[PDB]
A paper describes a structure:
The voltage-gated potassium channel AKT1 is responsible for primary K+ uptake in Arabidopsis roots. AKT1 is functionally activated through phosphorylation and negatively regulated by a potassium channel α-subunit AtKC1. AKT1 is the first characterized hyperpolarization-activated voltage-dependent K+ channel in Arabidopsis thaliana, which belongs to the Shaker K+ channel family. Each subunit can be divided into four parts: the transmembrane segments comprising S1–S6 and the pore loop; the C-linker which contains the helices A’B’C’D’; and the CNBD.
Author numbering:
A (entry chain D), B (entry chain A), C (entry chain B), D (entry chain C): 49 to 510
Write the structure that this text describes.
């Protein structure tokens, strides 16, 4: 019994697609270039016939994945009936050797050799898989699919066109017979290289003009091949345009955003400190790829029982190490952890201005900042904060404008919390506002500062 | 009076467009290769003209979808006024046979045969109709339109360039007279194949170099035809590029989403159960085409009197089979059914965590989940729920944090109901939360558990 | 002062761009094909120089629309300062006749004739203006710009390459002397046609291979011209791709929406009346181009002082001619008019379901609809409403759920008013709720209906 | 220690990329066209190798910007470990002169010279830098990168194909020996020009047909080179298409908006004053490039501690120069300044209608507007307001419909302020509402709208 997702089974898959690439080269070559068996190739041909014999002896069962349950179905019957519904005679007769066919019909040599190209469904499913896969980048996958179909079309056309040249009385006034007088006397590698040269030169529309059609059957095949090439080249340029437009869109929108904001700052004559705070923020929003750019861009599309657990993994020790949440509850901790906004901040940037409306408070993870107070125009720092300290809580828990300006003097990470979101959580778990006010004003009674807020809040209650 | 949207009438339209394809090949061929009528085509010309005369009779009773009413005007007068004011004269004069034209003037055979190309308006209307259809895929419709206009332009150019070769004294020092010494003695099929070969080799810009202009009239025509081909080839690449970019947008955005989120999970070093819950949800959000991905993309655009009846069709027996809604009303059932959000979930995923904020409850359709409680790290299941049961209703009807973690274990389907949305509904039908509390607390006393929720319930009531 | 936006002045501009097209042909032809003045062109050159001297006089009194005021500046000095600082010297030296140039030196004929290509700034400004216009579609504007730059590049390269063939001792063993040895005896039109034929054949990359370079200077020019052609062809395909991708996007997204919703309805097995109600609404949302589709899509971006007066112009007679607003106010009329949502509806579609939540009510503009009441599965129509009547108000002015079901039976236009939006307006102009209730309960006892609310709300009032 | 962001060091970078452009031309030319050392290039080779040896010495002490801190590491050890672990061996071996190679082996001259192309990492990093830079436009950066890779690939193929021509017995029956009889007896410049002509003619797919392959090794190289040119040509067209679609998107969406609004206004038969108010506003919403269009397009994405200071810089003198804010507070001024939405208005446009809902009020920055009042259909101005004065405050501070209609008459700039946003600020700073009412009614009593405003307004108050 063999199930998928098996590392003994994917070896078998990759070995089969290598044999498919073998057949993709060989079957047109036998169709267009060979009448006789020529055992220097035909021995290897019968050998890979034996490989496909042991292949079809092995292939009778493997489990699959059904939809609407997404479970693995392996039950030792229906596992071979389903596989023998569709193509069993095809790859069955695909293994009959050429000696058998010449014993049957000694004119359908290459005609029966051509039949083996059902095997290319493996390559099709492989490319569908790799597009569905997330390990290999989309660029090289689409590029490889294009080069495979291009080389296959070139090879098939060179084989068919040499077939048209050979299967003709009067070898002169054929397309190879027009300039090369005696090509049946020259080698097989030479004739294949000349036919592939013709096919490449025709497909890419270079067309030097040696090796051109002379009679009518060559003209008809060349008309349909050039219509095919026109469609194929349009398909290639379309895929390459898609592939470039996807690949350079993020940098494009980033540059347009930067250009618009810097153009705004110049026509309004902003101070340059404000100007490069703007550009520092808008630059750091970009190159935090999969830290803070993809964070709010992908965590939004999660069903909120997942990103609550993501927030519980990344930030839960930090909410046990802040003074305002000492012994409040355990339900309140998970709920406050579940609704933070982890944000980055480049160095030398104010994150709370003085006399703001009270709306947010922040909790550091890393980096440092300074509390900056102004008196009559001179900026004086007050107190540097450390990674793990809450800032902005004075006035948000109250209803007062903010007291100090907070400038991140290094690269930092803060956790924003909106005020009405903070209150709507602590309107629930009633009686826990008491412990929040208690471990606030027992922290405000500390620090030995000239407490004007402490005397104002006690009258503010009653 | 024949109506449109009719199965007897569409067959007549399709037979007409088959005759239009006939005329599109034959008329440039007559203009380029023929002087006589040559009755082996004149008979078929008069047959096709007879069918077009039958259709120009038949069109006097066929209704039309008029705008501003979107009804069908079918009244045997003003249904001919619209026809005679639009294009009656041109498909009148397209129907006239050519023996009358040679009876008038023995010069205007080809110039009158070229006038039958007014019939291509049917092809244009057909392609517009097929692009407006939802049955035939847009890809091959655009591909068919491009190949038809390409083949028609190649055919017209081949016939015109052969005409420039023909109506010229000294057949030598023409383009076919340059290499083929005696082309007037060789057959008509040979000359048509050679002109198609020239026109293809020029349009695809292969240009082998034989069959080139040698005098000035051929150079002028070839200049204008190469300019037309430049515009046409750019048009084909533009259409194929559009057709590729629209075809591979969904897979592209899905892959970018998966890449960004898996890139997020690696830098933050999440536990792998969390990591493949994330990837399982983001994968299942894709391949629910026309069940869940198209659901909240198309239902939101509907004017809410439609999606309410869609929700009434799919999920109305289910809300009669839950304990919490027994005999409340019939108005409340329709209102709650109207505002459920059906969502899919891959197996092995938490959908409600323990100690969450009480915001949602869910109703199964299919699949099962498990209530999971943690005490000291060890997590045991409590009560597996069945398809058709409600989870999360405790604490939403109350105001308490959630009690158990709900982990799915099959491909489930849940119906989310928001809390404030739920309370805004039961304020209407006021006095019918009495039955809700009644069949809650009577249900809470059915199973054996701590019924301390009834203790906090009654002190909260009175 | 001659103003812009002037019909006496635009005709002068159009005549000037006709003269610029003349110069763009003639100046490279004189540079490459001529040495003498040759009066059949010299007369016309001096005429065109006279017209450009007339315009370089006329440009001293013509107003300009400056920025930061968007007002026409007309001052007769500083209207010449702006002109002299911009391009007065270059179109001065473009205007000088060439007989003075041969008076200076008998070598600088063509090199001075090429300097007249400064006049193409008029063409550039013209194409910028026509892109900023809304009367000429963007498609053919971009197409005309592309064919102009392409024809001009072809023409200049043909002239330069004939010049390289001409200015050469041993005229044989040049590119034109390779096949036509006596090319200096054959006509000027013939040599211009063969040069244009070469130049088209190189630019399209057809490249027949006759008329190819034979010495080193021709090879160097041909390398640079083919690099230019590579860039130019990529530019042309890029413009045509932009022009196709924009032009086929609305139909594309409409088709994708139809495909997704019809796919959704199939796998959920909805009843077909529901299914074609969905398709009728989704179709009618599309083909109301600039009636209802562009209405919500463009009125949203307006600053709400404009669309209020748009709503006031379209629908103000209707709110006077409805019974519920008889003698209410005039401020409340303007405010309710300003916040309606005019919406179209296809025939055979329910717009309000029975037992809905009371959220909206509607007012007909045109079209007809029917009330539908059901009790035991039988749909009985109650009362057809006429174009200009309000439906849905019984329950929104009250708080009860809806009482009937309204199916549109023609192409209708309704005006939606949301309930919470309706109540926020009637708080202002207080006391007008009394007259709304008054002409509501006065309206219940109008037809002497078997009422079941007329006493049920007067007990709520009294 | 040397730092980046330094003008002594960037000049060294530019001089190195000049020497890289030198080596990119010279190394394939030596590989293809030279066997000898030939001191007229060998001297310059040793000079350029000396400069790269100076740079590989100099690079041990130059600071780098590490991630996760965005600071400059400068420590004189581990700043060399990073350099030794990245690419030290490759630009070591690129520096070695070729006389050492001919001391080793007198056949490995060009085979060693081709290894000097490791220096192109300088060019690649330069293009990455210039795309990330915001001073040079993205258009010509991508265009220059494309022409550099195109000319380099052409140059390499020309050198390799001449190498296949040269290293061959029987110089006749090569590709250059086919038409040129004795190419070894002709100049070096001639052979380089002919090889470059072949390589351009093959890459652009013109392909005249002279200079075509005649033996098998040339056919194999030409097959791989035409496949490469197919890939590169699709890549160039894709890049130019990306570049054009991004370059003309703003004008495209603007034109589509203008088209939809003008088409809406025509099918609904609006009065033309309303119609060109619509088009005036929608035009002005475009050509405020980085004044009003990019203003709310970029300030929205800012973390609101930045744009609060932007609003504080641009608009803070104005809030001290308005009568309603005389001595109110100092925190309230910063909060009100922080939440103003500045807009532009084209001339002759109503910005507030009479009998609107009281929702907004506006403060002029620059420009003049008028007040328009209707009596029975005749409208005239009442009072012109000048830049710096507030309009619409009467009735927003109250709860009354508006009193006048405010029409602009120049390019104006107003500051919108929402009513509920205004009240949610003045609920904070309590007691400052008293001074707002006080300096309103002292302004209302002074400004003689004669009696009925001050009297009826005080009836609401007391
Ligand atoms: C006028 C214009 C007329 C135009 C008419 C002709 C149009 C031709 C279009 C060509 C399309 C080619 C094609 O089908 O390619 C892909 C399938 O490739 C495949 O199925 C891959 C098959 C690969 C087989 C070859 C494998 C390698 C063999 C190499 C041998 C070479 C030997 C050389 C020495 C498409 O796929 P899709 O994009 O639709 O996919 C799902 C969506 N994304
Ligand atoms: C410098 C460059 C200068 C360029 C100047 C020339 C530019 C050429 C542009 C070509 C446009 C072709 C065209 O009109 O195609 C479509 C119309 O096709 C149609 O109306 C379909 C007509 C089909 C006729 C052929 C029917 C089959 C005949 C078979 C003959 C077989 C002969 C075989 C030997 C356009 O439509 P659209 O795209 O705008 O549509 C709506 C949007 N999508
Ligand atoms: C390796 C690769 C190397 C590539 C190097 C070559 C690159 C080629 C780029 C070609 C650009 C052409 C160009 O500048 O065209 C437009 C300007 O034309 C204009 O502004 C209008 C110029 C019109 C000139 C011709 C006027 C009519 C003359 C008629 C003569 C007829 C003679 C017939 C025998 C561009 O504009 P844009 O797109 O940047 O615009 C604003 C954004 N949309
Ligand atoms: C069937 C189909 C088969 C297809 C097979 C062939 C595929 C070809 C792909 C070509 C890619 C070219 C390439 O690598 O170009 C760029 C790198 O250029 C660079 O790294 C720049 C290198 C510049 C070197 C040349 C410098 C100047 C030399 C001057 C020579 C002077 C000669 C004078 C006669 C790509 O970059 P990307 O776009 O991936 O970048 C990051 C994303 N945006």
């Amino acid at each position: 019994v063999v199930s998928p997702y098996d590392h003994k089974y994917r070896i078998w898959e990759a070995f089969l697609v290598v044999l498919v690439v073998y057949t993709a080269w060989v079957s047109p070559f036998e169709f267009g270039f060979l009448r006789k068996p020529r055992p220097p190739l035909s021995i290897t041909d019968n050998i890979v016939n034996a490989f496909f014999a042991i292949d079809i002896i092995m292939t009778f069962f493997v489990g699959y994945l059904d939809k609407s349950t997404y479970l693995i179905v392996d039950d030792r019957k229906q596992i071979a009936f389903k596989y023998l519904r569709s193509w069993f005679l095809l790859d069955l007769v695909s293994t009959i050797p050429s000696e058998a066919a010449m014993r049957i019909s000694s004119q359908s040599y290459g005609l029966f050799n051509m039949l083996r190209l059902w095997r290319l469904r493996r390559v099709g499913a492989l490319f569908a898989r790799l597009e569905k896969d997330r390990n290999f980048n989309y660029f090289w996958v689409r590029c490889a699919k294009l080069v495979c179909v291009t080389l296959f079309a070139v090879h098939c056309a060179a084989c068919f066109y040499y077939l048209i040249a050979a299967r003709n009385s009067n070898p002169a006034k054929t397309w190879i017979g027009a300039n090369v007088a005696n090509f049946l006397e020259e080698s097989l590698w030479m004739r294949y290289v000349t036919s592939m040269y013709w096919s490449i030169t025709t497909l890419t529309t270079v067309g030097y003009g040696d090796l051109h059609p002379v009679n009518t059957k060559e003209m008809i095949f060349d008309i349909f091949y050039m219509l095919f090439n026109l469609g194929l080249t349009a398909y290639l340029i379309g895929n390459m345009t898609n592939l470039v437009v996807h690949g350079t869109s993020r940098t494009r929108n980033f540059r347009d955003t930067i250009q618009a904001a810097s153009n705004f700052a110049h026509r309004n004559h902003l101070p340059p400190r404000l100007q490069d705070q703007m550009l520092a923020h808008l630059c750091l929003k970009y190159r935090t790829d999969s830290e803070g750019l993809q964070q709010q861009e992908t965590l939004d599309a999660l069903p909120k029982a997942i990103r609550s657990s993501i927030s519980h993994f990344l930030f839960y020790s930090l909410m046990d190490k802040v003074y305002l949440f000492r012994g409040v509850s355990n339900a309140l901790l998970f709920q406050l952890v579940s609704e933070m906004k982890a944000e980055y901040f480049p160095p030398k940037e104010d994150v709370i201005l003085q006399n703001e409306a009270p709306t947010d408070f922040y909790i550091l993870v890393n980096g440092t900042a300074d509390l900056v107070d102004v008196d009559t125009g001179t900026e004086s720092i007050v107190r540097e904060v450390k990674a793990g300290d809450i800032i902005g809580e004075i006035g948000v828990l109250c209803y007062r404008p903010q007291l100090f300006t907070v400038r991140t003097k290094r690269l930092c990470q803060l956790l924003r919390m909106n005020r009405t979101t903070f209150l709507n959580i602590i309107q629930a778990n009633v009686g826990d506002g008491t412990i929040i006010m208690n471990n606030l004003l027992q922290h405000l009674k500390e620090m030995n500062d000239p407490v004007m807020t402490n005397v104002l809040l006690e009258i503010e209650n009653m």
